[model samples]
Target: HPETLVKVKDAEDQLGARVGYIELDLNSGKILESFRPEERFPMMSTFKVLLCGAVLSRVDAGQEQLGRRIHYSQNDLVEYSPVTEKHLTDGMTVRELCSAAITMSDNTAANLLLTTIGGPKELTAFLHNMGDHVTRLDRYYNDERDTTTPAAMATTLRKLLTGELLTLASRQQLIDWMEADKVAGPLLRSALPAGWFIADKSGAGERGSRGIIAALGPDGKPSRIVVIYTTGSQATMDERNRQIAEIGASLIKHW
Candidate 1:
């Protein structure tokens, strides 16, 4: 799948939109390959992953407890989904909220999380502490919100997975949290064969002006983390992103 998408993106690049990719072996902590991986792009839904880190940081610092219950009282719900339109049952915990944010890409859950953690100000501070300087979380929209660079996110994932960012326990907890990603952007999932467990999340715009794909591991070991963000002709956005994702999938399959 990774190979096919690589070819697809290469082929499609002729149409004037290049596919940007970042692949890393999470185990060995090596950079496999990349295409235009640097520079800032709309954090889109992909930013949710970093925010998860921020949430976890707070949990670790005892500023907030993961299992503690919280309320989703915000009126803005457009970040990741339509769930905010309806009031939450209010029995969910911080851990559950983060899990929902990942597994369901629940905008409401993220909004509530941001609010709970003192919003983006705290989140960004936490990200810097983790050495994830290239990623940014300045805005607070449910959908068209924060943006990140492929270089920053891919490297950050490698650090988190390899225990390079902190203690081994922190790495595992981060992975566990990401497995709960809910956003439906197809950087990893759409490219892989069914039943493969990929701790990843997807993010994009209404028209897919550009989409982001993140994978926790290349194979079952999750030794590799891949980051991809692309902006191109809207007409080719879906297919282009799909191509990159499938390529990433193949990398995971064969790795």
Candidate 2:
């Protein structure tokens, strides 16, 4: 609706940030609402979802095994690695690493998986091979080099979650991990109506950049894919998150 589009623009003006958002009908592959969907925004921890997908693709090809244990030391740890930090001594399975990365946004786990998939360049190549030309991963965490447009991200999420990018088992695992995410409860999920299910990954980074990529619907089947991003403002994360939530509320209200 034009009013929802107006609400999104009003949010950007209110927060003094550029908001790039896209809402899609997952089943029909239709664009429902969009604003600056081609603009790039830092992927932040949200890239972890894609990182794990690349690894899962390797698994589906029989080149990797999720049961294999990967060991790491304290020196391998990065900031916000709550799960991996504790497992430094015993090590963790590949599946566990993916879980920690997605559900908890574990920095160390993400880095480990990034290395497993051959770094930022390889991940970019993976995206390219998947027919997503707009998303690129230039570096590891905390770098603005990792970026994606809202439309590109929504397309990638739809493909991966809808069983086009990975095998059925891998797809279900990724969806389950997203559904278990600990980060979205206060962001987009907060604005969703009752009985609607959301499987999402949320990201926050420098300069008040924050975003969410999600699949939402009732009855445990996703019918909509929403990608919302904000950048180029020095607003506090609280203010940024509130603006994003407001935008999400507007989208839902229009639906």
Candidate 3:
């Protein structure tokens, strides 16, 4: 863990950034490494995962169904993972929205889902019951307004995997999206060794933020979870991408 931490620090130093990170061992329920993990930072679109869980919990309880269709007008579309890109005049189902949100980081899809199953306040309450007191999604895609600590984000992922927040069936669906994610293609996913496995979500903008990577053991269950949230005044996207990859590679190798 110390060795991994040292490498992570080196990468952060190169990027002029603060990398707030946590690596947890889910099999043994232990934190393998951490650095300034309590510090809250803008999560950008990464907070969508929290919002995703909130709605899925409702689905699991039968309050909502994934097959429910949402009709989109001109007002429903937004940039990135756009609803406009899908040429469906009849609109899409909740399952489709969730797929787009998780796999594409589709902003419009996320906002639509949020509105569908309550909003930011509702999500904050959902997190509170799961023992996360500090994380909050107060606004949509507004980085400063939507914030979470690295530890809090990692804990949320842990709960999702353990079926504490969602039914196991729903949990597996979420993990499937993460594993099939085309987003984070260059970050945690690109850096790891060929054989090591990952299921992850990544977000970056003015914040150049967090990515959650679950490292799998030989039997195909997540053995370790690595979460890194970065904030920087002097880093470009490419630099941050390399830094994140280096950090992940080191962590996987050491673990």
Candidate 4:
């Protein structure tokens, strides 16, 4: 764990950056490594993961059917999450909305999903119940909440990989949804090798950009969750973020 801290700090220094790292071992729910583990940033687009889980919890509870279609009101559209709402089918399934939220970062889909699921009420209680106090939804995708540090996001991503945060199927489904995001080009994925399996979603916030990266430790085998969060570096960040990602990918590739 200390080695992780050292390496992440080293990368930050090398890139004229500041970063937060957290590792969640899926099998044991052990937090293996961390620095600034509790620092909070806006959660950015990463907040969709919480929405994903809340959707699952509802599905698992039989409160909402994944196939049950829901339509978008004006409330649904216009936000950071992507959209599948333009051709509003009077009925779209809950599962489909979830797909739009994660896969497309659809704001319309997310808000509608939030309305159907439980919004911040369920998400906050869900995380608190898990013994890790980390996130808040604010106002769907609006500027209502503050920020979440890269570290909290690392914890959340780790949970998603472990199936501890949701169902095993849900965890994998979330991973698949994240993989489908189209706008991930600047921070984490901007520099990783194409063959290795890495899951991420990126958002550049008000101050600048931030990222969340999770590499499944064993890929196919039961594996550990390696996570990273970085935001706001005033230096020559193009080269730096790429180099930091390379360094990070190397570290996790060894895990």
**Top-lDDT candidate index:** 2
- Please, what are the lDDT tens digits per residue for candidate 1 over residues 1-255? 356456546645643554556777666666777666775666666666667776776666777787898755444556545544454655578877777776777877787788887888777777778787666677676233465667777877666556545455555666776766555556566666655567776666544345554554434545557766655545555575566566665676666
Model 3 Cα lDDT, one tens digit per residue, 73-185: 76667677464358458788888888888788888888889888778888888888888888888876334457788788787778877646689889888778777677787
- Expressed as tens digits, the lDDT of each residue in 1-255 for candidate 4 is 465567778777865566666776667767777777776655666677667777776776777677886665664567554456464556577777777766667777777777776666667766667654656665766242635655566656666566555777777777777767666655555544545565666555544345555554334443555556555566454554565566466555556
Candidate 2 per-residue C-alpha lDDT over 78-196 given as tens digits, one digit per residue, 9 for 90 to 100: 88989998997899999999999999999999989988888989989998999899899987753436889989998888888884789999988999999999977778888887788
Every model's Cα RMSD, please? 3.8, 1.6, 2.0, 3.6
Ranking by TM-score: 2, 3, 1, 4
Sorted on lDDT, highest at the top, how do the candidates line up? 2, 3, 1, 4
Query: What Cα-based lDDT does every candidate model obtain?
Result: 0.64, 0.87, 0.76, 0.63
- TM-score-wise, the better of 2 and 3 is 2
Report backbone clashes per prediction. 25, 0, 0, 15
Model 3 lDDT at residue 136:
82
Q: TM-score, each model?
A: 0.80, 0.96, 0.92, 0.79
Better of 3 and 4 by TM-score: 3
lDDT for residue 242 in candidate 3, whole number 0-100 = 80
Number of the candidate with higher lDDT, 1 or 4: 1
Query: Over the full model, what C-alpha lDDT does candidate 2 score relative to the true structure?
Result: 0.87
